[PDB]
Amino acid sequence: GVGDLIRKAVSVIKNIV
Amino acid sequence: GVGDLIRKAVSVIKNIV
Ligand SMILES: [K+]
Ligand SMILES: [K+]
């Protein structure tokens, strides 16, 4: 769902650097 | 350079939802 999409997005952002 | 790509990626992520 959208909730998990945004949860995953935070994970991506935390690994992006 | 590379940093602008990472910054743009964060914007991209923020415009999915
Ligand atoms: K930028
Ligand atoms: K959005």
PDB file of all heavy atoms in Angstrom:
ATOM      1  N   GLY A   1       0.834  -1.215   0.000  1.00  0.00           N
ATOM      2  CA  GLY A   1       0.000   0.000   0.000  1.00  0.00           C
ATOM      3  C   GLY A   1       0.860   1.253   0.000  1.00  0.00           C
ATOM      4  O   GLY A   1       2.098   1.169   0.046  1.00  0.00           O
ATOM      5  N   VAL A   2       0.215   2.415  -0.083  1.00  0.00           N
ATOM      6  CA  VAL A   2       0.988   3.686  -0.041  1.00  0.00           C
ATOM      7  C   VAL A   2       1.812   3.829   1.229  1.00  0.00           C
ATOM      8  O   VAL A   2       2.900   4.380   1.232  1.00  0.00           O
ATOM      9  CB  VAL A   2       0.068   4.917  -0.214  1.00  0.00           C
ATOM     10  CG1 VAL A   2      -0.934   5.053   0.904  1.00  0.00           C
ATOM     11  CG2 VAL A   2       0.844   6.204  -0.325  1.00  0.00           C
ATOM     12  N   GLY A   3       1.296   3.317   2.329  1.00  0.00           N
ATOM     13  CA  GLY A   3       2.022   3.453   3.569  1.00  0.00           C
ATOM     14  C   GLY A   3       3.351   2.764   3.462  1.00  0.00           C
ATOM     15  O   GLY A   3       4.394   3.321   3.820  1.00  0.00           O
ATOM     16  N   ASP A   4       3.364   1.534   2.972  1.00  0.00           N
ATOM     17  CA  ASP A   4       4.638   0.798   2.878  1.00  0.00           C
ATOM     18  C   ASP A   4       5.555   1.433   1.798  1.00  0.00           C
ATOM     19  O   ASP A   4       6.765   1.332   1.898  1.00  0.00           O
ATOM     20  CB  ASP A   4       4.455  -0.721   2.600  1.00  0.00           C
ATOM     21  CG  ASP A   4       3.930  -1.483   3.765  1.00  0.00           C
ATOM     22  OD1 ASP A   4       3.837  -0.982   4.878  1.00  0.00           O
ATOM     23  OD2 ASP A   4       3.624  -2.683   3.567  1.00  0.00           O
ATOM     24  N   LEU A   5       4.954   2.029   0.777  1.00  0.00           N
ATOM     25  CA  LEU A   5       5.723   2.716  -0.310  1.00  0.00           C
ATOM     26  C   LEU A   5       6.533   3.835   0.350  1.00  0.00           C
ATOM     27  O   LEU A   5       7.741   3.941   0.178  1.00  0.00           O
ATOM     28  CB  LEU A   5       4.770   3.240  -1.404  1.00  0.00           C
ATOM     29  CG  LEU A   5       5.401   4.034  -2.513  1.00  0.00           C
ATOM     30  CD1 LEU A   5       6.453   3.236  -3.258  1.00  0.00           C
ATOM     31  CD2 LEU A   5       4.234   4.394  -3.444  1.00  0.00           C
ATOM     32  N   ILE A   6       5.877   4.640   1.184  1.00  0.00           N
ATOM     33  CA  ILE A   6       6.553   5.740   1.831  1.00  0.00           C
ATOM     34  C   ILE A   6       7.556   5.228   2.863  1.00  0.00           C
ATOM     35  O   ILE A   6       8.631   5.758   2.975  1.00  0.00           O
ATOM     36  CB  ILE A   6       5.535   6.730   2.453  1.00  0.00           C
ATOM     37  CG1 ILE A   6       4.778   7.470   1.327  1.00  0.00           C
ATOM     38  CG2 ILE A   6       6.244   7.692   3.409  1.00  0.00           C
ATOM     39  CD1 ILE A   6       5.641   8.336   0.438  1.00  0.00           C
ATOM     40  N   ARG A   7       7.211   4.167   3.597  1.00  0.00           N
ATOM     41  CA  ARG A   7       8.204   3.502   4.482  1.00  0.00           C
ATOM     42  C   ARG A   7       9.442   3.078   3.714  1.00  0.00           C
ATOM     43  O   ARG A   7      10.599   3.293   4.159  1.00  0.00           O
ATOM     44  CB  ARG A   7       7.564   2.312   5.219  1.00  0.00           C
ATOM     45  CG  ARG A   7       6.652   2.787   6.335  1.00  0.00           C
ATOM     46  CD  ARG A   7       5.775   1.658   6.903  1.00  0.00           C
ATOM     47  NE  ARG A   7       6.535   0.489   7.382  1.00  0.00           N
ATOM     48  CZ  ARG A   7       7.144   0.392   8.576  1.00  0.00           C
ATOM     49  NH1 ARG A   7       7.016   1.316   9.496  1.00  0.00           N
ATOM     50  NH2 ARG A   7       7.787  -0.681   8.907  1.00  0.00           N
ATOM     51  N   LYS A   8       9.259   2.427   2.577  1.00  0.00           N
ATOM     52  CA  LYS A   8      10.390   2.065   1.753  1.00  0.00           C
ATOM     53  C   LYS A   8      11.149   3.263   1.249  1.00  0.00           C
ATOM     54  O   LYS A   8      12.369   3.194   1.115  1.00  0.00           O
ATOM     55  CB  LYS A   8       9.964   1.230   0.583  1.00  0.00           C
ATOM     56  CG  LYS A   8      11.150   0.608  -0.166  1.00  0.00           C
ATOM     57  CD  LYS A   8      10.651  -0.466  -1.129  1.00  0.00           C
ATOM     58  CE  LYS A   8      10.414  -1.786  -0.366  1.00  0.00           C
ATOM     59  NZ  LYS A   8      11.582  -2.688  -0.556  1.00  0.00           N
ATOM     60  N   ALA A   9      10.465   4.333   0.925  1.00  0.00           N
ATOM     61  CA  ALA A   9      11.095   5.553   0.405  1.00  0.00           C
ATOM     62  C   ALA A   9      12.057   6.095   1.418  1.00  0.00           C
ATOM     63  O   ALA A   9      13.144   6.550   1.076  1.00  0.00           O
ATOM     64  CB  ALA A   9       9.998   6.587   0.111  1.00  0.00           C
ATOM     65  N   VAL A  10      11.658   6.072   2.688  1.00  0.00           N
ATOM     66  CA  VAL A  10      12.544   6.537   3.752  1.00  0.00           C
ATOM     67  C   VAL A  10      13.774   5.651   3.752  1.00  0.00           C
ATOM     68  O   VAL A  10      14.923   6.164   3.910  1.00  0.00           O
ATOM     69  CB  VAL A  10      11.827   6.462   5.135  1.00  0.00           C
ATOM     70  CG1 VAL A  10      12.807   6.629   6.285  1.00  0.00           C
ATOM     71  CG2 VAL A  10      10.745   7.493   5.203  1.00  0.00           C
ATOM     72  N   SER A  11      13.602   4.326   3.681  1.00  0.00           N
ATOM     73  CA  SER A  11      14.790   3.489   3.586  1.00  0.00           C
ATOM     74  C   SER A  11      15.712   3.810   2.428  1.00  0.00           C
ATOM     75  O   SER A  11      16.925   3.814   2.577  1.00  0.00           O
ATOM     76  CB  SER A  11      14.402   2.033   3.470  1.00  0.00           C
ATOM     77  OG  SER A  11      13.683   1.631   4.662  1.00  0.00           O
ATOM     78  N   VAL A  12      15.143   4.081   1.272  1.00  0.00           N
ATOM     79  CA  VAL A  12      15.968   4.438   0.093  1.00  0.00           C
ATOM     80  C   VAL A  12      16.752   5.730   0.374  1.00  0.00           C
ATOM     81  O   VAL A  12      17.963   5.819   0.100  1.00  0.00           O
ATOM     82  CB  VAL A  12      15.088   4.532  -1.163  1.00  0.00           C
ATOM     83  CG1 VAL A  12      15.855   5.159  -2.320  1.00  0.00           C
ATOM     84  CG2 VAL A  12      14.601   3.173  -1.543  1.00  0.00           C
ATOM     85  N   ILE A  13      16.060   6.732   0.905  1.00  0.00           N
ATOM     86  CA  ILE A  13      16.685   8.021   1.178  1.00  0.00           C
ATOM     87  C   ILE A  13      17.840   7.809   2.192  1.00  0.00           C
ATOM     88  O   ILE A  13      18.918   8.376   2.029  1.00  0.00           O
ATOM     89  CB  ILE A  13      15.639   9.031   1.725  1.00  0.00           C
ATOM     90  CG1 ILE A  13      14.657   9.417   0.625  1.00  0.00           C
ATOM     91  CG2 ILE A  13      16.304  10.247   2.341  1.00  0.00           C
ATOM     92  CD1 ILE A  13      13.519  10.234   1.154  1.00  0.00           C
ATOM     93  N   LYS A  14      17.672   6.921   3.166  1.00  0.00           N
ATOM     94  CA  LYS A  14      18.676   6.662   4.190  1.00  0.00           C
ATOM     95  C   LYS A  14      19.897   5.942   3.638  1.00  0.00           C
ATOM     96  O   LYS A  14      20.921   5.774   4.388  1.00  0.00           O
ATOM     97  CB  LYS A  14      18.139   5.666   5.259  1.00  0.00           C
ATOM     98  CG  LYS A  14      17.298   6.252   6.320  1.00  0.00           C
ATOM     99  CD  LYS A  14      16.773   5.127   7.166  1.00  0.00           C
ATOM    100  CE  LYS A  14      17.853   4.584   8.086  1.00  0.00           C
ATOM    101  NZ  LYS A  14      17.277   4.243   9.405  1.00  0.00           N
ATOM    102  N   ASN A  15      19.756   5.369   2.415  1.00  0.00           N
ATOM    103  CA  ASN A  15      20.862   4.657   1.792  1.00  0.00           C
ATOM    104  C   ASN A  15      21.406   5.341   0.602  1.00  0.00           C
ATOM    105  O   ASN A  15      22.362   4.861   0.034  1.00  0.00           O
ATOM    106  CB  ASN A  15      20.462   3.235   1.462  1.00  0.00           C
ATOM    107  CG  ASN A  15      20.396   2.383   2.704  1.00  0.00           C
ATOM    108  OD1 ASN A  15      21.403   2.085   3.306  1.00  0.00           O
ATOM    109  ND2 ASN A  15      19.184   2.073   3.130  1.00  0.00           N
ATOM    110  N   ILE A  16      20.890   6.544   0.300  1.00  0.00           N
ATOM    111  CA  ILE A  16      21.156   7.199  -0.975  1.00  0.00           C
ATOM    112  C   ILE A  16      22.509   7.896  -1.011  1.00  0.00           C
ATOM    113  O   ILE A  16      23.018   8.180  -2.101  1.00  0.00           O
ATOM    114  CB  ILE A  16      19.989   8.161  -1.327  1.00  0.00           C
ATOM    115  CG1 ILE A  16      19.927   8.333  -2.861  1.00  0.00           C
ATOM    116  CG2 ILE A  16      20.153   9.511  -0.652  1.00  0.00           C
ATOM    117  CD1 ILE A  16      18.678   9.050  -3.360  1.00  0.00           C
ATOM    118  N   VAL A  17      23.084   8.162   0.156  1.00  0.00           N
ATOM    119  CA  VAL A  17      24.416   8.765   0.283  1.00  0.00           C
ATOM    120  C   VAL A  17      25.385   7.677   0.680  1.00  0.00           C
ATOM    121  O   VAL A  17      26.512   7.698   0.231  1.00  0.00           O
ATOM    122  CB  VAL A  17      24.412   9.857   1.338  1.00  0.00           C
ATOM    123  CG1 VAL A  17      25.788  10.464   1.544  1.00  0.00           C
ATOM    124  CG2 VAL A  17      23.447  10.961   0.940  1.00  0.00           C
TER     125      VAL A  17
ATOM    126  N   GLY B   1      27.375  17.692 -11.141  1.00  0.00           N
ATOM    127  CA  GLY B   1      28.102  16.478 -10.749  1.00  0.00           C
ATOM    128  C   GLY B   1      27.117  15.537 -10.106  1.00  0.00           C
ATOM    129  O   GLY B   1      25.929  15.704 -10.206  1.00  0.00           O
ATOM    130  N   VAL B   2      27.684  14.577  -9.401  1.00  0.00           N
ATOM    131  CA  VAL B   2      27.005  13.468  -8.754  1.00  0.00           C
ATOM    132  C   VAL B   2      26.013  13.926  -7.693  1.00  0.00           C
ATOM    133  O   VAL B   2      24.913  13.405  -7.595  1.00  0.00           O
ATOM    134  CB  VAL B   2      28.024  12.472  -8.147  1.00  0.00           C
ATOM    135  CG1 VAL B   2      27.322  11.290  -7.481  1.00  0.00           C
ATOM    136  CG2 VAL B   2      28.966  12.011  -9.252  1.00  0.00           C
ATOM    137  N   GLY B   3      26.378  14.980  -6.976  1.00  0.00           N
ATOM    138  CA  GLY B   3      25.552  15.368  -5.830  1.00  0.00           C
ATOM    139  C   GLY B   3      24.210  15.861  -6.292  1.00  0.00           C
ATOM    140  O   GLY B   3      23.183  15.615  -5.639  1.00  0.00           O
ATOM    141  N   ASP B   4      24.205  16.565  -7.437  1.00  0.00           N
ATOM    142  CA  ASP B   4      22.949  17.097  -7.960  1.00  0.00           C
ATOM    143  C   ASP B   4      22.033  15.959  -8.333  1.00  0.00           C
ATOM    144  O   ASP B   4      20.818  16.098  -8.244  1.00  0.00           O
ATOM    145  CB  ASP B   4      23.196  18.010  -9.146  1.00  0.00           C
ATOM    146  CG  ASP B   4      23.574  19.422  -8.751  1.00  0.00           C
ATOM    147  OD1 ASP B   4      23.640  19.779  -7.547  1.00  0.00           O
ATOM    148  OD2 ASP B   4      23.807  20.215  -9.702  1.00  0.00           O
ATOM    149  N   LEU B   5      22.618  14.860  -8.819  1.00  0.00           N
ATOM    150  CA  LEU B   5      21.796  13.683  -9.167  1.00  0.00           C
ATOM    151  C   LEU B   5      21.157  13.075  -7.920  1.00  0.00           C
ATOM    152  O   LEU B   5      19.980  12.656  -7.924  1.00  0.00           O
ATOM    153  CB  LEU B   5      22.655  12.620  -9.876  1.00  0.00           C
ATOM    154  CG  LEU B   5      23.256  13.076 -11.197  1.00  0.00           C
ATOM    155  CD1 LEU B   5      24.212  12.037 -11.754  1.00  0.00           C
ATOM    156  CD2 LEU B   5      22.186  13.412 -12.216  1.00  0.00           C
ATOM    157  N   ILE B   6      21.916  12.989  -6.829  1.00  0.00           N
ATOM    158  CA  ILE B   6      21.326  12.459  -5.599  1.00  0.00           C
ATOM    159  C   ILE B   6      20.235  13.351  -5.051  1.00  0.00           C
ATOM    160  O   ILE B   6      19.173  12.868  -4.569  1.00  0.00           O
ATOM    161  CB  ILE B   6      22.420  12.233  -4.548  1.00  0.00           C
ATOM    162  CG1 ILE B   6      23.349  11.117  -5.050  1.00  0.00           C
ATOM    163  CG2 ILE B   6      21.786  11.881  -3.211  1.00  0.00           C
ATOM    164  CD1 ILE B   6      24.567  10.906  -4.192  1.00  0.00           C
ATOM    165  N   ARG B   7      20.471  14.654  -5.092  1.00  0.00           N
ATOM    166  CA  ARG B   7      19.440  15.603  -4.660  1.00  0.00           C
ATOM    167  C   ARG B   7      18.210  15.542  -5.499  1.00  0.00           C
ATOM    168  O   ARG B   7      17.132  15.628  -4.984  1.00  0.00           O
ATOM    169  CB  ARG B   7      20.061  17.007  -4.686  1.00  0.00           C
ATOM    170  CG  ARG B   7      21.095  17.170  -3.573  1.00  0.00           C
ATOM    171  CD  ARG B   7      21.957  18.396  -3.729  1.00  0.00           C
ATOM    172  NE  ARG B   7      21.206  19.647  -3.959  1.00  0.00           N
ATOM    173  CZ  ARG B   7      20.798  20.463  -2.980  1.00  0.00           C
ATOM    174  NH1 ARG B   7      21.090  20.160  -1.733  1.00  0.00           N
ATOM    175  NH2 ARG B   7      20.146  21.567  -3.259  1.00  0.00           N
ATOM    176  N   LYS B   8      18.372  15.413  -6.821  1.00  0.00           N
ATOM    177  CA  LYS B   8      17.222  15.297  -7.717  1.00  0.00           C
ATOM    178  C   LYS B   8      16.483  13.997  -7.404  1.00  0.00           C
ATOM    179  O   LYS B   8      15.256  13.949  -7.414  1.00  0.00           O
ATOM    180  CB  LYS B   8      17.667  15.271  -9.151  1.00  0.00           C
ATOM    181  CG  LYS B   8      16.542  15.241 -10.189  1.00  0.00           C
ATOM    182  CD  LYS B   8      17.110  15.465 -11.592  1.00  0.00           C
ATOM    183  CE  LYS B   8      16.559  16.773 -12.157  1.00  0.00           C
ATOM    184  NZ  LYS B   8      15.190  16.674 -12.768  1.00  0.00           N
ATOM    185  N   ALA B   9      17.221  12.914  -7.196  1.00  0.00           N
ATOM    186  CA  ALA B   9      16.576  11.666  -6.788  1.00  0.00           C
ATOM    187  C   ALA B   9      15.680  11.779  -5.583  1.00  0.00           C
ATOM    188  O   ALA B   9      14.583  11.187  -5.549  1.00  0.00           O
ATOM    189  CB  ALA B   9      17.594  10.598  -6.542  1.00  0.00           C
ATOM    190  N   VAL B  10      16.112  12.522  -4.582  1.00  0.00           N
ATOM    191  CA  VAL B  10      15.239  12.695  -3.408  1.00  0.00           C
ATOM    192  C   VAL B  10      13.933  13.408  -3.845  1.00  0.00           C
ATOM    193  O   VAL B  10      12.842  13.033  -3.425  1.00  0.00           O
ATOM    194  CB  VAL B  10      15.971  13.513  -2.376  1.00  0.00           C
ATOM    195  CG1 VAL B  10      15.077  13.961  -1.218  1.00  0.00           C
ATOM    196  CG2 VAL B  10      17.191  12.737  -1.868  1.00  0.00           C
ATOM    197  N   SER B  11      14.015  14.411  -4.753  1.00  0.00           N
ATOM    198  CA  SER B  11      12.790  15.096  -5.221  1.00  0.00           C
ATOM    199  C   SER B  11      11.903  14.114  -5.964  1.00  0.00           C
ATOM    200  O   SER B  11      10.691  14.163  -5.839  1.00  0.00           O
ATOM    201  CB  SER B  11      13.132  16.312  -6.114  1.00  0.00           C
ATOM    202  OG  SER B  11      14.082  17.120  -5.427  1.00  0.00           O
ATOM    203  N   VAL B  12      12.529  13.214  -6.718  1.00  0.00           N
ATOM    204  CA  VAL B  12      11.799  12.307  -7.537  1.00  0.00           C
ATOM    205  C   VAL B  12      10.986  11.398  -6.666  1.00  0.00           C
ATOM    206  O   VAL B  12       9.795  11.086  -6.988  1.00  0.00           O
ATOM    207  CB  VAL B  12      12.728  11.457  -8.429  1.00  0.00           C
ATOM    208  CG1 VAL B  12      11.929  10.319  -9.050  1.00  0.00           C
ATOM    209  CG2 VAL B  12      13.299  12.360  -9.529  1.00  0.00           C
ATOM    210  N   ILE B  13      11.651  10.955  -5.600  1.00  0.00           N
ATOM    211  CA  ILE B  13      11.018  10.070  -4.659  1.00  0.00           C
ATOM    212  C   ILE B  13       9.823  10.738  -3.993  1.00  0.00           C
ATOM    213  O   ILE B  13       8.784  10.097  -3.718  1.00  0.00           O
ATOM    214  CB  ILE B  13      12.044   9.699  -3.592  1.00  0.00           C
ATOM    215  CG1 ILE B  13      13.097   8.783  -4.181  1.00  0.00           C
ATOM    216  CG2 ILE B  13      11.332   9.090  -2.388  1.00  0.00           C
ATOM    217  CD1 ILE B  13      14.252   8.558  -3.225  1.00  0.00           C
ATOM    218  N   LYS B  14       9.987  12.000  -3.665  1.00  0.00           N
ATOM    219  CA  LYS B  14       8.895  12.786  -3.074  1.00  0.00           C
ATOM    220  C   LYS B  14       7.707  13.152  -3.969  1.00  0.00           C
ATOM    221  O   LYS B  14       6.701  13.765  -3.513  1.00  0.00           O
ATOM    222  CB  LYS B  14       9.463  14.059  -2.528  1.00  0.00           C
ATOM    223  CG  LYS B  14      10.263  13.772  -1.274  1.00  0.00           C
ATOM    224  CD  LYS B  14      11.022  14.977  -0.806  1.00  0.00           C
ATOM    225  CE  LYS B  14      10.065  16.035  -0.256  1.00  0.00           C
ATOM    226  NZ  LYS B  14      10.841  17.069   0.495  1.00  0.00           N
ATOM    227  N   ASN B  15       7.815  12.875  -5.247  1.00  0.00           N
ATOM    228  CA  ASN B  15       6.695  13.097  -6.194  1.00  0.00           C
ATOM    229  C   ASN B  15       6.053  11.850  -6.760  1.00  0.00           C
ATOM    230  O   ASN B  15       5.297  11.933  -7.704  1.00  0.00           O
ATOM    231  CB  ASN B  15       7.101  14.009  -7.321  1.00  0.00           C
ATOM    232  CG  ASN B  15       7.298  15.423  -6.869  1.00  0.00           C
ATOM    233  OD1 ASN B  15       8.434  15.889  -6.805  1.00  0.00           O
ATOM    234  ND2 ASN B  15       6.242  16.070  -6.465  1.00  0.00           N
ATOM    235  N   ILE B  16       6.303  10.708  -6.120  1.00  0.00           N
ATOM    236  CA  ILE B  16       5.619   9.456  -6.498  1.00  0.00           C
ATOM    237  C   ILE B  16       4.177   9.400  -5.965  1.00  0.00           C
ATOM    238  O   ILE B  16       3.200   9.153  -6.691  1.00  0.00           O
ATOM    239  CB  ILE B  16       6.428   8.253  -6.006  1.00  0.00           C
ATOM    240  CG1 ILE B  16       7.778   8.207  -6.732  1.00  0.00           C
ATOM    241  CG2 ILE B  16       5.653   6.961  -6.215  1.00  0.00           C
ATOM    242  CD1 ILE B  16       8.739   7.156  -6.203  1.00  0.00           C
ATOM    243  N   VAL B  17       4.029   9.681  -4.701  1.00  0.00           N
ATOM    244  CA  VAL B  17       2.740   9.690  -4.036  1.00  0.00           C
ATOM    245  C   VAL B  17       2.062  11.056  -4.230  1.00  0.00           C
ATOM    246  O   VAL B  17       2.710  12.110  -4.252  1.00  0.00           O
ATOM    247  CB  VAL B  17       2.864   9.306  -2.539  1.00  0.00           C
ATOM    248  CG1 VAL B  17       1.486   9.253  -1.897  1.00  0.00           C
ATOM    249  CG2 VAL B  17       3.490   7.922  -2.347  1.00  0.00           C
TER     250      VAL B  17
HETATM  251  K     K C   1      20.195  20.268  -6.793  1.00  0.00           K
HETATM  252  K     K C   2       4.237  13.587  -3.203  1.00  0.00           K
END
